Every structure is written in C-alpha cells, then in structure tokens.
Amino acid sequence: PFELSGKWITSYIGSSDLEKIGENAPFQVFMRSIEFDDKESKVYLNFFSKENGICEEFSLIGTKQEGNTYDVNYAGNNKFVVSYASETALIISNINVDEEGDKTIMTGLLGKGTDIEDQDLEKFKEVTRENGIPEENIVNIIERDDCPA
Numbered sequence: 001p002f003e004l005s006g007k008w009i010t011s012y013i014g015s016s017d018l019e020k021i022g023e024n025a026p027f028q029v030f031m032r033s034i035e036f037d038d039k040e041s042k043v044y045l046n047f048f049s050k051e052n053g054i055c056e057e058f059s060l061i062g063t064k065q066e067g068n069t070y071d072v073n074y075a076g077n078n079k080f081v082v083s084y085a086s087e088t089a090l091i092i093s094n095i096n097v098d099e100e101g102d103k104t105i106m107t108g109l110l111g112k113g114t115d116i117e118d119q120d121l122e123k124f125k126e127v128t129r130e131n132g133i134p135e136e137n138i139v140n141i142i143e144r145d146d147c148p149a
C-alpha cells in the first residue's frame with residue numbers, strides 16, 4: 001500500500017516555457033509536502049518559491065477533479081496529475097494557464113529530500129520528453145534549493 005501523502009522535496013523540473021522556471025519565476029517550486037485528502041477530495045501543497053531573491057512559503061489547497069486530475073490556483077490556473085509514484089519518488093505533470101492565457105506544460109520529480117535515485121530520474125526525463133519538453137529545459141532544483149526545511 002503506497003503512501004503518497006507526506007514529505008516531498010523537488011529535485012528536477014522540466015517546462016515547455018523557460019520563463020516560468022528560471023530564477024525567481026513562479027514555477028521554480030521547492031516542494032516541502034503534499035497531502036492527499038481523498039475523503040474530502042482535496043490536496044494540500046506546501047512549498048517555497050523565490051521572489052526578489054528571498055524565500056516565500058506557500059500553502060495551497062487544490063480540489064480533485066475528473067480522473068486523477070487536481071485543480072489549484074497559483075500564477076494562473078493549474079491542472080496537475082501524479083503521473084508516477086514509487087516509494088522514493090513522485091512525478092507531477094502540470095498544465096498552467098497564466099493570467100495572460102499562455103499555456104505551459106511542466107513536469108517535476110519529487111523525493112524524500114535526499115538523494116536522487118537514478119531510476120526515478122530516468123522516468124522523470126522520459127515523462128518530460130513525452131510531454132514534448134526538451135532536455136535543455138530541465139533545471140536542477142536541489143542545487144537551487146537553499147530555502148528553509
């Protein structure tokens with residue numbers, strides 16, 4: 001029985017739009033924890049993001065929708081799905097439509113902080129590729145995560 005809820009840190013993030021994941025961008029998300037409240041059909045996302053260089057924490061609440069999709073507001077509208085789940089990682093596929101209406105597809109590899117297991121990384125890169133996102137559009141989040149634990 002897989003436990004999806006708990007501590008989850010971001011290791012890598014791929015994106016179709018580089019403007020959304022650079023330094024201080026809305027999607028350079030340093031995950032801290034994700035909670036799946038299936039009884040209440042909600043999802044609790046906690047993370048840090050940089051704006052003007054300093055770390056800023058976020059505690060969002062998303063609602064479960066059709067299939068395995070989750071709706072959540074942040075820098076536009078988002079619809080994300082947990083494409084992959086193992087005992088060491090989680091791979092999220094998210095589609096964001098910002099305030100300007102620009103559509104951006106993104107992917108992310110989440111772990112228990114730690115150390116990255118190449119097995120999950122290869123799956124992340126494969127998912128990223130399948131979404132038409134090139135390898136050069138992948139950023140290493142762990143190297144950039146200096147935000148509070």
Ligand SMILES: CCCCCCCCCCC=O
Nearest residue numbers: 029031045074078092094108
């Ligand atoms: C932000 C993309 C991947 C981050 C890891 C978990 C998602 C929680 C916040 C999702 C908002 O998109």
